[PDB]
Amino acid sequence: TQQPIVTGTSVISMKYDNGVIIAADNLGSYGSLLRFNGVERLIPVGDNTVVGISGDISDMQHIERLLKDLVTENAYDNPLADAEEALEPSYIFEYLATVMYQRRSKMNPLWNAIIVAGVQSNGDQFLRYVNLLGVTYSSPTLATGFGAHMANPLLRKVVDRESDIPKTTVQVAEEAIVNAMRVLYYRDARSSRNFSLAIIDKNTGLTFKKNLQVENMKWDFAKDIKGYGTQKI
Amino acid sequence: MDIILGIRVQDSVILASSKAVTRGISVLKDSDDKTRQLSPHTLMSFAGEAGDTVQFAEYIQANIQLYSIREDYELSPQAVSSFVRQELAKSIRSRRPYQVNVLIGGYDKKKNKPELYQIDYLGTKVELPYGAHGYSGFYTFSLLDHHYRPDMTTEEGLDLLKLCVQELEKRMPMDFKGVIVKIVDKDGIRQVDDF
Amino acid sequence: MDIILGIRVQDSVILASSKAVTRGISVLKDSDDKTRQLSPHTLMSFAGEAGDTVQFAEYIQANIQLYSIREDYELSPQAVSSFVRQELAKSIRSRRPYQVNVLIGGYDKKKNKPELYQIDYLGTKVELPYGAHGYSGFYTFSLLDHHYRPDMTTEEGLDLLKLCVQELEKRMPMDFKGVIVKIVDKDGIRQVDDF
Amino acid sequence: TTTLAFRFQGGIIVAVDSRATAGNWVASQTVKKVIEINPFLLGTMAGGTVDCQFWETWLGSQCRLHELREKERISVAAASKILSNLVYQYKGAGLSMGTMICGYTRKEGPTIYYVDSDGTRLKGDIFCVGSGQTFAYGVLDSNYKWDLSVEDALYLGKRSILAAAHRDAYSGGSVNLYHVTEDGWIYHGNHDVGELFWKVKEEEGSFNNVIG
Amino acid sequence: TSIMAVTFKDGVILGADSRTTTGAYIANRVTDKLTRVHDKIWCCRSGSAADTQAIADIVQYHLELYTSQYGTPSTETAASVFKELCYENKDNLTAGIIVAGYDDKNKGEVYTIPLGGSVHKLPYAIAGSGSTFIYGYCDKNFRENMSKEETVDFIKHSLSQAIKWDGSSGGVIRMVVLTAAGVERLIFYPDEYEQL
Amino acid sequence: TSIMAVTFKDGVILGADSRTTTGAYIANRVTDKLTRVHDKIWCCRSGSAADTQAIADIVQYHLELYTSQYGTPSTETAASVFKELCYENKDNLTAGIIVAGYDDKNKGEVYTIPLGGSVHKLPYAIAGSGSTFIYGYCDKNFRENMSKEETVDFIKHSLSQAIKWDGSSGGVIRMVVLTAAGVERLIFYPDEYEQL
Amino acid sequence: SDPSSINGGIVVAMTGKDCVAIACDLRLGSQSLGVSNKFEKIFHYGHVFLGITGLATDVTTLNEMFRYKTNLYKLKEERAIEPETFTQLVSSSLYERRFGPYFVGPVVAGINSKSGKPFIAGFDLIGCIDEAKDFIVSGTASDQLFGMCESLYEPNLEPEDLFETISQALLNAADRDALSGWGAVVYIIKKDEVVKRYLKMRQD
Amino acid sequence: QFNPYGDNGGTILGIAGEDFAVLAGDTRNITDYSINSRYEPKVFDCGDNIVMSANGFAADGDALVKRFKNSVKWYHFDHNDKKLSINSAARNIQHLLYGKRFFPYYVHTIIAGLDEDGKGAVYSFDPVGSYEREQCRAGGAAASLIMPFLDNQVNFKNQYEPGTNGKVKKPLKYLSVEEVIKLVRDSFTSATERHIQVGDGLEILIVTKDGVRKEFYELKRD
Amino acid sequence: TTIVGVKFNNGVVIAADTRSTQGPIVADKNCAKLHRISPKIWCAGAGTAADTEAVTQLIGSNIELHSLYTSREPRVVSALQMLKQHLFKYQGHIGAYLIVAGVDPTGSHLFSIHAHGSTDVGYYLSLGSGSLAAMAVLESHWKQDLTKEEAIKLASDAIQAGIWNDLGSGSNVDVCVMEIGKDAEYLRNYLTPNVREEKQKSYKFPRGTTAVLKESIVNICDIQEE
Ligand SMILES: *[B]([O])([O])[C]([C][C]([C])[C])[N]C(=O)[C]([C]C1=[C][C]=[C][C]=[C]1)[N]C(=O)C1=[C]N=[C][C]=N1
Ligand SMILES: *[B]([O])([O])[C]([C][C]([C])[C])[N]C(=O)[C]([C]C1=[C][C]=[C][C]=[C]1)[N]C(=O)C1=[C]N=[C][C]=N1
Ligand SMILES: *[B]([O])([O])[C]([C][C]([C])[C])[N]C(=O)[C]([C]C1=[C][C]=[C][C]=[C]1)[N]C(=O)C1=[C]N=[C][C]=N1
Ligand SMILES: *[B]([O])([O])[C]([C][C]([C])[C])[N]C(=O)[C]([C]C1=[C][C]=[C][C]=[C]1)[N]C(=O)C1=[C]N=[C][C]=N1
Ligand SMILES: [Cl-]
Ligand SMILES: [Cl-]
Ligand SMILES: [Mg+2]
Ligand SMILES: [Mg+2]
Ligand SMILES: [Mg+2]
Ligand SMILES: [Mg+2]
């Protein structure tokens, strides 16, 4: 049993017709102090998987090292390491899910919420969640922390059920994700303007976008707001 | 205090109440009468926290005696029981509530019927053929459920009461030093001196 | 369990132990023998937490019986008491200690003397003319302090023991359902079937 | 829960209720609170559900192994002590058990052992265990004799559970009866309390307090 | 919360962020923490929103009644009325208030009233959770008798840093200028102050 | 505690106060918080004195044994050994360590290791109770590729403010310069840095 | 410890075609101990019926209180109080004890004498009005009652059909609750006749 | 302090027919007042004509189902591909649960299938391993809403025959698979209305001698 | 609970869902959360339901007396001030979280109120357990100079976000539009996207199915003449 010290906030994601999108801001908070401003919380595994992590950063860095070691180990005595016997999103997830549940069962959890986004060998979209308790679930849209409360409602308006996935293009999906990140910046007190975004497509592969910023923000209406009720000046 | 029982038969109400008073480690007394006569045809037994029991019982007694003198008339058991309930229902939301449970056995001279009322410290009133407070009911109710019939005589009621006390003396951990038994009927209140 | 007494007279040791077993609200049994024969001339009574008492007593019994067979010899009461003390003194610093108090009454055939040892669950041993565990001593020791004389006969010891039990039955709140009395002397161990 | 067992002329009567509760919620009215350890041995169930189920089935495995090894029926004393010694190992860990181990052998005759999760092991003639034990004791103590017929002994057990089922909120559902002789136990049916109450009330003249 | 008041040559300027939080949720991103208790006596509020509003409403009432009887109150007087409420009700209040005002006789004045209910007259004052991160900056960069433009830059840069590091601070930077000329409201948006 | 490490053109400089406190009592006013785990790999210590000493002693042992087998270790390697101890023993440790070192290949590097046991490579790092008061100042005044004299002034001014505001910080300002030229110790007394 | 589940009990109400029904169990207990099988929880003031679950002393106290208030109402107004008006009186009376409340779950049922419209309403312990079209539930087996009513109920049931529906809703809910049962009563209410039926149920 | 348990909501329902058995469960997964997934399968085909669901804490639920599926696999390896009977599967599950008696799988488990006589069978488990064969059982969040309805409409409790007035009970006539599915759908529709953790979708698994069939129905998504 | 308020060109609109819950159980499926303080001042309430009702009635009553005393139509700031001071006095124990809106001779207004007595001004606001789902929609689609039709659409969409995504909210959408120089229109059940489907079976019982012990006529009439 511990307490999280340096923490990362929301990770958000969704499926679209040819793949999956995932995103997370670049902040490492120390309580209310916005301590570290250059923290990458999306970690790619090969060219077909991106693992997005929230919660304790020291535990994130440990998981990052486990995944790095997983790639090394898979290559050992494996002539098809870059082909048929490459690491799948489903393999990477199940491994993490096993570790997370084992650690909670020893009363010494990895204090995180994780989303594994990727595309499988047969082109199928993979998107599944796991957290410190070992709880797992899948959905057309997935989000952690504040994203669960604010991002999902917006993303579910695009893809409300399974049959909405083929009808959703990559442009429409990315637009929705970027909008959700703006909303989170308006409303989450432990978020930052800077974020990373990753697209995993069955045709165009893995596109990893760094140093993105929230833009087109509405603040002008603030000038008209005066006092808390009766004040006019 | 500990065990208080009540049973209503054809033409009377019978109340049985333990004699023991225990202050923690020792039994200070083995002849204590846990009852007060409220009016000539109404008797109240009681059990609860020390001090509060007698204080409450005597306070009720004084109030009913005052009513009797003012109106030159005896209140019905139903009326007395309602007064007692209200006092306890008032008490439960006070600064320091009366921690007292009571049984009210009375003979209504107007209707020519015996009546038994069970009231707990919260002010929860029920009219019953037979009743008890505390753990007494846990041992005795199964016997009363089997044997009570509503046309019993007073002698049959005492025999069924003896069977209850015998079960209590067999299965209860505490020695309650026997019971004082009192009968309430058309002629008033009397004590059974050999039980 | 509840009350265990012991008294050493001229030529014997007498142990008295209650018969009741109570599981919270009900008295499950009224004929329980809270004692074990460790050897032909050594008897141990016991009282403490449920389960632990019998488990400990039988464990000691097995060990003394093993010693007797191995050496073809009966250990002295003093030796048995020291073994028992050490087991309890070991127990008190264990993960889960034996919550058991004991009296060891024995007749030493070498010295031709009766001997009574009182040991609590901590492993606190004392040799006494008369002893008790729990609240039993609070009622009985004043009577024993007055009447006890060490040249007492076994019949005088039983009479003084009756006076103790009568005081317990008068002033204790709990009904312990009487006592089983056993005598330890040069001829061995026997039970007084009428008490 | 209300479970009882008593010794008499014809052997042992065992009677239990059927109710299981989680708080005020009635989880089940069809619980088998008697465990058939073998054709000759019965165990009652009271306290926490699984503990008594699990360890009394386990007890049956130990008894079977005993008589395979020793070529002889296990005594009630030995069977009860296997269970009591086992639970004593778990003392403190939080097991919740109150049970009667009932049997009939040549050397012992009809025997009942109260076994307890605090380690208690008591031999006796009459035992009632559970939240409604006090209600059942009342009927038993006043009507119990050694010279009871198997028919009358069965009814007394049935009636004593009914008494508790009525008053105790955490007892009810139905009554399971068993009769234990030397040649083995004999099941005497499931009796719904809903039907049994009205039947007994009418035929026996009892429960005049209740309207029917 | 990041709030501050700074005296300068022509008077005094109050500055504040616009973020109100319920834990990590921003309940209001465009809050007005600069509040008016008299024509040229304003205050900055930190701590409980309910408490500081209740206090500010009572003070405005007191000063309105003072004005009707004895004419315009001093800034010191306003600070004393704030203190009296904060001190006497210290056990039940969570309020950190900065009082700033402009007289013609006394010119620009700043009084800070921390949790206890004590009063401290200062050349400039900082308060709120975000103030901790700018003690170093403000101490090094404050000068007395600055110009209006310099003081606006000092507050803008200071609160910019406080917002950058404190999660409880954010949104727009509001300011209120108090001089002989009158009362001027200023607003500065994230795109402006983040690139500083 | 007020500690910091800053990379610059010629390498890296570590800086620290000298105050150790048991509550409000200053148990040692001339403490050396800049400690050596290798010739040109040093660290700044904050948190428990016992824990950070125990850790630093173990790290020095590990790097001494590394050197005997594999030659001079990198700064990254040293930071990893610190991390491994702090992360794996997070439940029993209270240690906030900054690791700073000079290679010829990698030049000056700074790694900060906060409570959790995470690692963060940065151009400069601040830590300790007193660091809270200089986030604003340091962010506004840090530049990359500063000179030795500029970096000494940056650290001296920064820790001066941290000391001024934090009760847990005080005494002398110690510094350790790490360059190709070697290892230089600097000390600055209260009469010097208080008047800044 | 929890005041609302010391004594136990349930009440349920339903609307039908030109009629309403209200029903309750008869149990009063002291936790596990069953004390009385004749503790009726439905009372009536004129044509307005009130069921009350929860702590029994408060059930009795409130009945006496509303009898008191509806009697004064009638003397002053020169007419019987209507269900809609009585509902507001219950709410007002409960809320005045906001920070020292009666631990109860009241249920109002009746037909407006002028409009002929069937009316039911429920409350929490502190006055909030739940005015449902279909049904209202209250007591220690309210979850069970919600499940029964939600499946068994259909609108515009005739009086004799509505009786069967509400009776089966109560009985089967009570049998899944340890602190409810020991008898039951059902009131069928029409504009100018009210029938009261005691139900035969298991007594455990 | 770290809390190793959580509550993922959901509700499940098992009903045993004369020559069939159904195990149903909603597809909604939640924490607190948020929806995690509107379609997260909860009832699983475990092989050997056995269906299983472990409702409550989903992490423990998944772990248990995973270990039982594993147990079926090794039962085949160790005992010459013998079919694991429903009664044997039940006893095995008790030991899986009791193995963690002092750190329990926080779930309400239900399995369904056919017994060795071909008749419908349902078994029900508490978190610590106590089990019992049943004709009817609901588990999880809205179990208290559903069970009373099933006592009335499956076992005809408190129902009697018209004209006799309480003397003659309604006879316990057998229900078809079409009749059971109707009662399952109405049970979940009703539960969805009054329980916030129930909704989104209903997935039913039907077990007959022919094998395991699936049916899916929409539920209200609010 | 999801409640919102949205300013527009010539007035203000408020909306709310219709679900009330005791723990995880739905107590009422069609609850009314839009309260009338005065003819053209309405507020929506979240939190403890008895409190939002009671505090609205009390202030609404005093507002009516104040309006009669002054011979003026009531103002939103008056309702705001009276509500906040009442709630502050009770130190948060009266659990009423309100969105207060209306039109008066001063113009159109929109405020929020929390239980401890703090107030906030805004063009768009949301309160309750589904406020985060609603606020997400508001932050995505709100603009300056909304029309009446656009504001109603935005308000109901924000409630829908709460209905679908928040377990504390559900059922229907209630709306109330308050435009300047017009009567306030209260649109009860403006949307109904949660009608229950037909059941598979009818559960109407055969008459005589339930066992009866006794029957009797209840005397509801008064004591009779003659
Ligand atoms: B009986 O009432 O003791 C009964 C016996 C058990 C073997 C079925 N116990 C229970 O029903 C207990 C509750 C209880 C009531 C009274 C005394 C002791 C215990 N039930 C549970 O422990 C339980 C736990 N989880 C789910 C359901 N029931
Ligand atoms: B600021 O962060 O101190 C701010 C000033 C306030 C006057 C608007 N306070 C708040 O945001 C407080 C919480 C708080 C944060 C940090 C320190 C102290 C207090 N918020 C509230 O009082 C609040 C939050 N949600 C609703 C209503 N009020
Ligand atoms: B600094 O203030 O963090 C300092 C650094 C240490 C390595 C010399 N720590 C201390 O002075 C600590 C107390 C402390 C103060 C502030 C934050 C965390 C810890 N002191 C000690 O560990 C200490 C005190 N007295 C004797 C021995 N050790
Ligand atoms: B919403 O979720 O804020 C909603 C708004 C209310 C005005 C209808 N709140 C409720 O429904 C509250 C939730 C709550 C539960 C427990 C304590 C406090 C608040 N419900 C009730 O007020 C309620 C519950 N049951 C009956 C009556 N009222
Ligand atoms: Cl504010
Ligand atoms: Cl040191
Ligand atoms: Mg001793
Ligand atoms: Mg019962
Ligand atoms: Mg200092
Ligand atoms: Mg919803």
PDB file of C-alpha atoms in Angstrom, chain B residues 3-106:
ATOM      1  CA  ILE B   3     -37.001  -9.988  33.740  1.00  0.00           C
ATOM      2  CA  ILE B   4     -40.593  -8.698  33.589  1.00  0.00           C
ATOM      3  CA  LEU B   5     -43.468 -10.802  32.216  1.00  0.00           C
ATOM      4  CA  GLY B   6     -47.175 -10.247  31.617  1.00  0.00           C
ATOM      5  CA  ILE B   7     -50.122 -12.366  30.651  1.00  0.00           C
ATOM      6  CA  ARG B   8     -53.767 -11.635  30.131  1.00  0.00           C
ATOM      7  CA  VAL B   9     -56.358 -14.316  30.786  1.00  0.00           C
ATOM      8  CA  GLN B  10     -60.199 -14.451  30.790  1.00  0.00           C
ATOM      9  CA  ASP B  11     -60.892 -12.209  33.785  1.00  0.00           C
ATOM     10  CA  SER B  12     -57.512 -10.843  34.973  1.00  0.00           C
ATOM     11  CA  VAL B  13     -53.984  -9.684  34.133  1.00  0.00           C
ATOM     12  CA  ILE B  14     -50.953 -11.298  35.793  1.00  0.00           C
ATOM     13  CA  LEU B  15     -47.564  -9.554  36.059  1.00  0.00           C
ATOM     14  CA  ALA B  16     -44.361 -11.345  37.101  1.00  0.00           C
ATOM     15  CA  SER B  17     -41.176  -9.405  37.882  1.00  0.00           C
ATOM     16  CA  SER B  18     -37.745 -10.541  39.151  1.00  0.00           C
ATOM     17  CA  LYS B  19     -36.529  -9.791  42.686  1.00  0.00           C
ATOM     18  CA  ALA B  20     -32.784  -9.394  42.099  1.00  0.00           C
ATOM     19  CA  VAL B  21     -30.900  -6.097  42.048  1.00  0.00           C
ATOM     20  CA  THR B  22     -27.264  -6.364  40.945  1.00  0.00           C
ATOM     21  CA  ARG B  23     -24.663  -3.694  41.138  1.00  0.00           C
ATOM     22  CA  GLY B  24     -22.022  -5.037  38.848  1.00  0.00           C
ATOM     23  CA  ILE B  25     -20.234  -7.715  40.852  1.00  0.00           C
ATOM     24  CA  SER B  26     -22.602  -8.326  43.820  1.00  0.00           C
ATOM     25  CA  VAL B  27     -26.330  -8.978  44.229  1.00  0.00           C
ATOM     26  CA  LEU B  28     -27.270  -6.197  46.676  1.00  0.00           C
ATOM     27  CA  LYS B  29     -30.889  -7.325  47.152  1.00  0.00           C
ATOM     28  CA  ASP B  30     -33.067 -10.390  46.457  1.00  0.00           C
ATOM     29  CA  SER B  31     -36.554  -9.116  47.383  1.00  0.00           C
ATOM     30  CA  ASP B  32     -37.031  -6.020  45.193  1.00  0.00           C
ATOM     31  CA  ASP B  33     -40.554  -5.205  43.972  1.00  0.00           C
ATOM     32  CA  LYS B  34     -40.270  -3.755  40.449  1.00  0.00           C
ATOM     33  CA  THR B  35     -43.827  -2.408  40.272  1.00  0.00           C
ATOM     34  CA  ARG B  36     -46.054   0.546  41.200  1.00  0.00           C
ATOM     35  CA  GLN B  37     -49.814   0.790  41.658  1.00  0.00           C
ATOM     36  CA  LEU B  38     -51.009   3.658  39.444  1.00  0.00           C
ATOM     37  CA  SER B  39     -54.680   3.285  40.410  1.00  0.00           C
ATOM     38  CA  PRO B  40     -56.840   0.689  42.257  1.00  0.00           C
ATOM     39  CA  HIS B  41     -57.317  -1.362  39.041  1.00  0.00           C
ATOM     40  CA  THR B  42     -54.060  -0.494  37.182  1.00  0.00           C
ATOM     41  CA  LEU B  43     -50.554  -1.845  37.864  1.00  0.00           C
ATOM     42  CA  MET B  44     -47.273  -0.994  36.103  1.00  0.00           C
ATOM     43  CA  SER B  45     -44.107  -3.114  36.179  1.00  0.00           C
ATOM     44  CA  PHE B  46     -40.804  -1.697  34.904  1.00  0.00           C
ATOM     45  CA  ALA B  47     -37.214  -2.502  33.930  1.00  0.00           C
ATOM     46  CA  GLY B  48     -34.320  -0.435  32.552  1.00  0.00           C
ATOM     47  CA  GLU B  49     -31.376   1.694  33.690  1.00  0.00           C
ATOM     48  CA  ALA B  50     -30.760   2.154  37.413  1.00  0.00           C
ATOM     49  CA  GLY B  51     -32.449   5.147  39.063  1.00  0.00           C
ATOM     50  CA  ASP B  52     -34.382   6.088  35.901  1.00  0.00           C
ATOM     51  CA  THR B  53     -36.792   3.166  36.430  1.00  0.00           C
ATOM     52  CA  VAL B  54     -38.097   4.119  39.884  1.00  0.00           C
ATOM     53  CA  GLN B  55     -37.900   7.867  39.110  1.00  0.00           C
ATOM     54  CA  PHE B  56     -40.105   7.359  36.043  1.00  0.00           C
ATOM     55  CA  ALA B  57     -42.516   4.912  37.707  1.00  0.00           C
ATOM     56  CA  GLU B  58     -43.138   7.159  40.726  1.00  0.00           C
ATOM     57  CA  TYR B  59     -43.502  10.202  38.456  1.00  0.00           C
ATOM     58  CA  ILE B  60     -46.234   8.406  36.483  1.00  0.00           C
ATOM     59  CA  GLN B  61     -47.848   7.188  39.719  1.00  0.00           C
ATOM     60  CA  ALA B  62     -48.011  10.755  41.069  1.00  0.00           C
ATOM     61  CA  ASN B  63     -49.625  12.040  37.844  1.00  0.00           C
ATOM     62  CA  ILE B  64     -52.342   9.356  37.735  1.00  0.00           C
ATOM     63  CA  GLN B  65     -53.081   9.814  41.456  1.00  0.00           C
ATOM     64  CA  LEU B  66     -53.406  13.566  40.800  1.00  0.00           C
ATOM     65  CA  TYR B  67     -55.888  12.920  37.978  1.00  0.00           C
ATOM     66  CA  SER B  68     -57.907  10.564  40.206  1.00  0.00           C
ATOM     67  CA  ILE B  69     -58.290  13.193  42.948  1.00  0.00           C
ATOM     68  CA  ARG B  70     -59.084  16.061  40.548  1.00  0.00           C
ATOM     69  CA  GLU B  71     -61.854  14.208  38.678  1.00  0.00           C
ATOM     70  CA  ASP B  72     -62.898  11.721  41.406  1.00  0.00           C
ATOM     71  CA  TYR B  73     -62.660   9.047  38.706  1.00  0.00           C
ATOM     72  CA  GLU B  74     -60.308   6.229  37.673  1.00  0.00           C
ATOM     73  CA  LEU B  75     -58.828   6.463  34.157  1.00  0.00           C
ATOM     74  CA  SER B  76     -59.185   3.438  31.876  1.00  0.00           C
ATOM     75  CA  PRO B  77     -56.094   1.231  31.353  1.00  0.00           C
ATOM     76  CA  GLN B  78     -56.134   2.339  27.696  1.00  0.00           C
ATOM     77  CA  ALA B  79     -56.078   6.009  28.753  1.00  0.00           C
ATOM     78  CA  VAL B  80     -53.291   5.457  31.309  1.00  0.00           C
ATOM     79  CA  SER B  81     -51.204   3.521  28.759  1.00  0.00           C
ATOM     80  CA  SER B  82     -51.552   6.335  26.202  1.00  0.00           C
ATOM     81  CA  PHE B  83     -50.424   8.887  28.810  1.00  0.00           C
ATOM     82  CA  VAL B  84     -47.399   6.724  29.647  1.00  0.00           C
ATOM     83  CA  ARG B  85     -46.530   6.237  25.956  1.00  0.00           C
ATOM     84  CA  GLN B  86     -46.614   9.988  25.311  1.00  0.00           C
ATOM     85  CA  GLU B  87     -44.283  10.622  28.264  1.00  0.00           C
ATOM     86  CA  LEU B  88     -41.764   8.118  26.871  1.00  0.00           C
ATOM     87  CA  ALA B  89     -42.172   9.383  23.278  1.00  0.00           C
ATOM     88  CA  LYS B  90     -41.477  12.890  24.617  1.00  0.00           C
ATOM     89  CA  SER B  91     -38.555  11.500  26.648  1.00  0.00           C
ATOM     90  CA  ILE B  92     -36.711   9.818  23.753  1.00  0.00           C
ATOM     91  CA  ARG B  93     -35.830  13.167  22.092  1.00  0.00           C
ATOM     92  CA  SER B  94     -34.858  14.859  25.394  1.00  0.00           C
ATOM     93  CA  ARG B  95     -31.377  15.857  26.580  1.00  0.00           C
ATOM     94  CA  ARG B  96     -31.187  12.697  28.714  1.00  0.00           C
ATOM     95  CA  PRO B  97     -33.956  10.143  27.906  1.00  0.00           C
ATOM     96  CA  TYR B  98     -35.648   7.831  30.411  1.00  0.00           C
ATOM     97  CA  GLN B  99     -34.118   4.396  29.786  1.00  0.00           C
ATOM     98  CA  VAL B 100     -37.209   2.502  31.007  1.00  0.00           C
ATOM     99  CA  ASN B 101     -39.406  -0.288  29.617  1.00  0.00           C
ATOM    100  CA  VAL B 102     -42.825  -0.964  31.157  1.00  0.00           C
ATOM    101  CA  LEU B 103     -45.785  -3.338  31.205  1.00  0.00           C
ATOM    102  CA  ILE B 104     -49.193  -1.937  32.162  1.00  0.00           C
ATOM    103  CA  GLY B 105     -51.732  -4.468  33.428  1.00  0.00           C
ATOM    104  CA  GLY B 106     -55.216  -3.158  34.190  1.00  0.00           C
TER     105      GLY B 106
END
